[PDB]
Amino acid sequence: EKTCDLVGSEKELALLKRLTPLFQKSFESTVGQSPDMYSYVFRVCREAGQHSSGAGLVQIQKSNGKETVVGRFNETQIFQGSNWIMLIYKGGDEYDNHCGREQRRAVVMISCNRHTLADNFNPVSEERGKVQDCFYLFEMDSSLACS
């Protein structure tokens, strides 16, 4: 029953409670093309990795099957916007390349969409092989982000 732990905020806890219906869902997306193909696994307040490292979102590199923690849910921040919700997981694995040695962080932009409870999970910004944004941004739709 390990859920999100808010970095620190109760206004914030209300937002997490609103996202409860998504806790059991799993979200995944594969990017790139052989050889350098990667796969992202995202979950709301639940483990997304296979190394029980408390990861809220992971990047799996398809050459070695290596898992990189983008962010952990025990360091969660969440904000309500005009037609969206921004979920953030901090404390991921350190970049130890050109991006510096800072720990990765995961940002998921949940747009309001009354037609679906949750869908269309897709990466927008990443630090993946050739793509060097030194920033991880994902998007998805949810009727939960409405109002």
Added chain:
Amino acid sequence: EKTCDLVGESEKELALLKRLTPLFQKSFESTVGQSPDMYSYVFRVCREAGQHSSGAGLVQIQKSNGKETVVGRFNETQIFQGSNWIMLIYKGGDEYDNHCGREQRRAVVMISCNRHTLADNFNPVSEERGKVQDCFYLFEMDSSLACS
């Protein structure tokens, strides 16, 4: 003579950036909190935003003394787009050098689609300001330019 410089073509960010040109001449401002801990945020798209902080794309002005904090610089811009939204980021702001650590501040502006206006409704969502210690600056605004 200088405009937004991207971090790192990409001529998608480029093109995506050209889309915001009609906002260059506009000045955005939002005031928060109450006396004597009142603050003002001034934001501009690819243009100087502060009173005395050269290169700043968005500045936080403490109204009690006019002390200016650079949240982000437009010479370290990043810009992404999604379904009915565009995210503009200014990096290289002043370091927190506090409980947040010593990373540089960054300004994240989420622009949502609104066919009723070119640009409007700019205000803070997250901040490191007074008792509000999010160690993160997120702003939002409406713009027809973000309609996909």
